[model samples]
Target: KETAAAKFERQHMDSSTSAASSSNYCNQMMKSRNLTKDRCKPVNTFVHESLADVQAVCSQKNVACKNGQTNCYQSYSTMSITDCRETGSSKYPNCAYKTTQANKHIIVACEGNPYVPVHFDASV
Candidate 1:
């Protein structure tokens, strides 16, 4: 079983790369990370920061999650991130994504005793 913390590390964390070097990043990563296993995720984000910095977002300002959960938090400092949005031509088993890099304050939902981020809400 995958813990929320573990899943977050797998799906979002990418400290090895500082910036998106190519447009195919999303197309390659979205699948390599296993986000395209059953279906193509419509929108997903990859944080280009250390795991510790990303986790610290939980102590920031509180915000409502997109799905209405109240456990979300917004980052105070702008972080390097890549957003992968599925293109109109995207299809299951062949997901295509638009890779975009930005410096934005991210929003995420946290849970558990340690209060770590469990879901990526948005970026603004």
Candidate 2:
């Protein structure tokens, strides 16, 4: 149930595309993971601190865990955008292949303390 815009963005969107046109960092994560294959699910999935939800999902998947004091916006910015913008040559067109932020530090009381995922750097 993805809006035409969301579908268009995912299908034809690229890094050079505007943020509005391209997938939001949070949506990208869910889409890539096949977590939110549908449009309605993705929109609701990301509404508030959606990036944090991505982290939680990843943590549960053992794909990655949150690092201390680490945040999605900060981490994605450092890990993805900083390099993409500075290098100008990205793995994905305009680095649209990558997500922009993560919600690593946010707290999700329903899910338990530190809503963000736990750190995996030391082990990595």
Candidate 3:
């Protein structure tokens, strides 16, 4: 069976690289990250930090997830992040994205024995 934790890593982790504020960041990252394969992800965020730092968020301040779930955590430290949003006219096969980079605290939903992130909640 597939795990949501792995899916979260595939969608949100980008520690090995950075966009350097390039305008085409999303265009390349979205495809390279495999998010554009099936269809364009309406929106997604990538954190440029080690997987450990991200997993650490699961132990931070406990809060309700966007969907009202109680198993959510908000990171206490800020991180470099690139937010990719699908452009209005973008479509499947040629999924286009708008990349917005910034440093902010991230929110995520977690589960399981070790409690790693399973869903990217938000960044602010």
lDDT string for model 3 (1-124, tens) is 7689999998899898754357798899889888888878889899999999999999998988889889888889888899999998898999888889899999999999887999999887
Cα error, candidate 1, residue 99 (Å): 0.6
Badly placed stretches (over 4 Å) of model 1 are: none
Model 1 Cα shift for residue 71 (angstroms): 1.2
Model 1, span 25-116: residue lDDT tens? 99999999999999998998999999899989999999888898799999999999999999999988889999999999999999999999
Local distance difference test values of all predictions, in order: 0.92, 0.30, 0.88
- Residue by residue across 1-124, what tens digits does model 2's lDDT show? 7653344234322343223224354444444634334322312112222343324433432222244333222122111110011122333222333333322322211122434432223111
Cα displacement (angstroms), candidate 1, residue 39, comes to 1.0
Clashing pairs in 3: none
How high a TM-score does candidate 2 get? 0.20
Better of 2 and 3 by lDDT: 3
Best by lDDT: 1
CA shift of 97, model 1, Å: 0.9
Error of 3 at 115 (Å): 1.3
